Assembly symmetry: C4
Homo-oligomer: 379 residues x 4
């Protein structure tokens, strides 16, 4: 297949991250894309090594006494730190170990999306992807800064206790697994949002049909037809993406619920003791901010897609009300008016949950319960 | 745009409340309405000042010892009082700081609503708004009385402890923020309910089409068409209002859940100690009544709108069953019978929750859990 | 209006119960029915008196010491007994004080139901009501027996402690309020289930249209039309009943959730002490059975109505698949196939909850939480 | 009726398990099937005997002191062991005591399924059932191994304490009831999944209609009709199966929620004491795995059926978009496009819950609450 503009860049990031084993060749505005068996094998080696190192680190930190373990001063702290580490190793594992199938899925649907773009204004439509890439890359940079600053803070806790080398080798795996699960989450928030921008362009191309019939190189008598076919393809591609991501997309939500449990637990315990550990207190608040912003980066592209859905259901009904009775346009709008009832576009990871924003009301409805219930066992 | 009747009065209230930066000019039954940049800047100054004063008050009350702090006798009381104050400052802030965009939204949809009223019986239709205004203003008067009586009670607690000036300056901000969030909530319960009354008038204008065809200046062959167009416009306007309010409409619900947690906590603790503080006990019960009545003033206009929805789905199906087969009326009723399946009228703030009355079953399903869980940490 | 068969008997029960202020005159198989202002005033007097007596009883039992109060041995026992009494006084009050409007609703919809029965097999269709009455009356008899046996047990606790007269006058009101709320709940479970039996008869009258067209005094070309009109009327009547009952129908569910909290609390505390109070232990288990069976008598007629709904959606689609293309029957089946998408028949009290059986999964999902949370405060 | 291929084998298992009282006669690839009154009476005797023996065992283990009761060392352990046993006796009872009606249901729907298969590729379609049987039998073998290993472990606990005969006779009933409820659950996961495979074959037979019209012994003008009739029959059969299983299908889910409460309770208590009981610790973890895998064997065939549903709604809309306007194929696709809106295929046991995979999010949302709440009462 062919990738045009910044989608090539976000995939290049996922490739060096081992989340997209793609080999590609340059073009004047594009890259031709292929799977490499070697890059798959490299990615499996890399993440298997980093998962082994992360588990070996967790085992070492469980073995070292609570006296020396600068964030694991008690059994309960060991339990919550194990929760912090382990589900991120789960998300990293189940994410990358599916990566070849996810890229088979992308190499399937992207040909259809290119065929759709060939009618829906592909000309300069890449500027939308350029803007979305420029916006989204800044999130990964911000997280990289925060992760490094976290490791530097714990490295200072190690240095002030004389244990730098061991606390380094115990966590350098875990931090890189965090970075990998961030790259997976951003890659989802890119693909599902470029598809949303294409839906927006389709929707405006339909909207101007309303003015064309009230008063675009073919009459609405044909244009509504060909747009309804594109409105089929731009559903099938959404169900492709929702399936190819559905497993890590739900695992990362479960891991983020667990982190929104574990991080406030630390914040509260570390302000029940004397607040003198100011750097820790701030770093944990910035982590709580990241553990919310990541969830908002998961759910926002879905809500902004389903709003394009609802606005298409609006503008079709406007057009259907203006269109003259019984003429061919009326029948083709009938076709579209049923299509919008059958092919409802919506992400749902493994079908396990409706990924619209009510998911945040549900997840916070769990977080606020479980945080308090868990704290109650500390005292 | 133009505002006729008491909608001008409720907007005038919101204007002096700094929730609607509208400049308007009088007419024999109406006002012409415009945004003023000066009234925007004034509103931003006013609410920024009152939020600064409210935070400065909360900081002062946290600084003053629990001995002298007549409702903050312990750390837990300080925590729950901070919850009481702060989310009301959040609602006031996020409410007013969006006000110019909300009035841009109103100045958009109200022209379409005036165009709809030009066909749906705008003649004397203002009496519905007059009645709704007369009913709703009494709620704001009642709340103003309750708020003043609360401040007078705490001022008496201050006077009997010799601390009147400090307890005054610590809370005069907070009370005015409460008043502002009440004005925002009432303004929603006006706009979303005037739109409901217009839906009712549309629905009756359709209902009498059933008698007209069984036996309104044009045949049903045209009237059902033009009504179906109005039935599009009276959906688009609902999605405009639901979006322009959606953010403060959900923040105020979250704040009201938090108050239905905090206020019963006070009531229970202040009846676990000796009930001699009769004025406090009554005032807190009246606050619990207000914290329920406000939520009912949020949800009731939605439920009474969706009941007009359901009754329109009923009466259309009556009309469709009587209408003769294959004649033009049958096709136009087909159009309407699909429109009612696509353009389902319903509020949903930011889409985050279905604002129908099942929301109260959900929110009380949370309140009764969290109140008990929180009390359990006191003892 | 006119009431035929056992519906007259169940209304006669509700009339002597003061839940249906109907004056009626006999016919050879029917009664003519009217509202009496005198029977309304009598019912308001009766329930106002019994609510005053029940509150006066609760006040007396709160005044008498826990030593003598044979089921109120502690403050917590007083709190849960107050919960037991008070929401039943709420249900009795809000039930009966709406009774005239509920009978206005019945005197409205029953004329339409008689008009429907005039086509859908009203001839001997009363035998369904006869069977349903015979079944449902046995539930009220069983509850009357259980209530009397409860009062006799507590009267024996009073006699063995020498306090019979006071414990009698403290509870004789409460028991009669329980009986009134049982009569209200049964009356709902009669009306909503006779309407279900009429839906079943309609559905079979449609089903045999499938054989008539595959091979009922008019061709399917007309019969499906007239049945679709009846299928409108048998929705409008359901929305009438669901609204006229919706308030006490939801209050009684909330009261039954509260009783499924309070009664197991007694059962557990009274088996944490020595089980020697065998009669009490059995009587409380029989009460827990009644507090489940009442909820099942509320929800079952709804689930058995919506199953007739779903089976009508099935059999219409069978008929639509056999019917020949383009002939008039195809258009009339199109009409019906949309009607089944718009006029979905379902009860919902005040819209506050979907009264289908998932309600029991939701309510038990609350009961099992709140029972344990409440017990945790006892020790 | 007639059963072809491995469905005969899974029914033969259920017959020796007393869950399917079928008498059958062999054919070259099939068996003719009948109910036997004798096999019904035998099954009622067998399960009544084993329920009596299981209750007698539970009573004996409650009678024997906590000193000797190798998994019932305290009252709380007796309570949770009673929960472990009793709801499995409930599931076994309510399962088998309905078995004749369930086989009446099967002997009804299987004739229609054979009639459908006569058009949808029944030729070699049995290989799908062969594969599904080969896969599913391995689950019952695995569970049999685990159950035997559990009984052998407890028999060793008995032998090392000299009490082998009594601990044998106290549990040999319970284990066989576990095996019976496993056979019931697998039988559901066979029937509901063979029906899914038939839906898949139907769906592909429709899909190739898209290529046939773009370019199967009759034109799409007929084929889409006859397929839409089969698409009715393959809904009616699903509602038959969902009803005939709905009661034990929901009871077994409730029992599995209760086991996911009770088993982690043991695991946690038996790791709060010293872990030396390694065999117990492993066996309880393998039980927790089984208590998850059983629930996944319940829900997975539903989710994989509703995905065939959604993919049929997709491919119909593809076909409807290609089909030429106004020709007969367009009307027959209109028929199908409404049928997919009315006859939505989905299991729901007793309607009490949507059995799609969101059920696992709901049930784990309960499990994680109730496990912690219950543990909190231990200490
Ligand atoms: C941005 C705020 C988003 C909250 C919007 C209002 C929530 C509506 C609601 O009432 O949902 C509740 C969410 O629980 C909750 O309060 C948890 C949400 C946070 C509010 C309560 C804790 C205070 C937060 C500071 C409970 O519902 P579910 O049991 O189904 O989960
Ligand atoms: C006016 C009363 C409105 C209540 C109507 C019956 C509630 C139906 C229900 O069963 O919903 C329950 C609401 O919880 C609840 O009892 C909380 C609602 C209040 C009832 C329980 C506390 C006693 C109130 C005095 C739980 O459901 P969700 O977990 O989804 O939230
Ligand atoms: C007849 C039994 C009916 C139960 C059917 C299975 C329940 C399905 C389920 O998982 O729903 C759960 C119901 O809670 C529950 O266990 C409470 C239902 C009772 C089961 C748990 C306690 C043991 C009962 C003895 C939780 O869901 P919601 O939070 O939305 O309320
Ligand atoms: C495979 C993991 C499946 C979990 C998928 C994410 C769950 C989405 C969610 O947020 O649902 C929550 C499920 O509760 C829950 O965390 C319980 C699910 C397990 C996650 C929390 C405990 C840690 C598990 C180790 C709460 O919702 P409901 O109150 O309606 O029930």
């Amino acid at each position: 297949c062919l990738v045009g503009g910044a989608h090539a860049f976000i995939l290049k990031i996922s490739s060096f991250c081992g989340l997209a084993p793609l080999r590609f060749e340059p073009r004047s505005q594009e890259y031709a894309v292929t799977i490499s068996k070697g890059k798959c094998f490299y990615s499996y080696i890399l993440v298997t090594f980093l998962v082994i190192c992360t588990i070996y680190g967790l085992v070492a930190e469980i073995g070292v006494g609570v006296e020396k373990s600068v964030r694991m001063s008690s059994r309960m702290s060991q339990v919550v730190s194990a929760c912090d580490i382990l589900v991120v190793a789960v998300t990293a594992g189940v994410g990358v170990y599916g990566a070849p199938a996810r890229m088979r899925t992308m190499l399937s649907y992207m040909e259809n999306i290119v065929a759709v773009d060939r009618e829906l204004g592909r000309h300069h439509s890449a500027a939308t992807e350029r803007k979305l890439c420029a916006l989204l890359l800044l999130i990964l940079l911000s997280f990289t800064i925060l992760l490094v600053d976290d490791f530097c803070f714990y490295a200072m806790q190690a240095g002030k206790t004389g244990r730098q080398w061991e606390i380094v080798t115990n966590y350098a795996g875990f931090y890189f697994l965090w970075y990998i699960v961030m790259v997976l989450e951003l890659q989802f928030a890119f693909t599902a949002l470029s598809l949303r921008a294409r839906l927006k362009l389709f929707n405006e191309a339909l909207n101007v049909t309303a003015s064309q019939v009230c008063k675009l190189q073919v009459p609405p008598c044909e244009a509504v037809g060909r747009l309804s076919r594109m409105r089929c393809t731009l559903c099938e591609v959404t169900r492709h993406i929702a399936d190819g991501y559905g497993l890590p997309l739900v695992i990362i939500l479960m891991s983020t619920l667990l982190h929104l449990i574990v991080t406030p637990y630390f914040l509260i315990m570390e302000i029940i003791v004397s607040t003198h550990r100011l750097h820790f207190l701030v770093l944990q608040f910035l982590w709580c901010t990241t553990h919310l912003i990541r969830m908002l980066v998961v759910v926002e592209p879905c809500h902004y897609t389903m709003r394009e859905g609802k606005r298409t259901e609006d503008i079709v009904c406007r057009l259907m009300t203006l269109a003259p009775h019984g003429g061919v346009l009326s029948s083709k709008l009938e076709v579209l008016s049923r299509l919008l009832m059958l092919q409802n576009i919506s992400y749902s990871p493994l079908g396990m949950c409706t990924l619209d924003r009510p998911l945040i009301v549900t997840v916070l409805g769990a977080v606020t319960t479980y945080l308090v219930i868990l704290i109650q066992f500390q005292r």
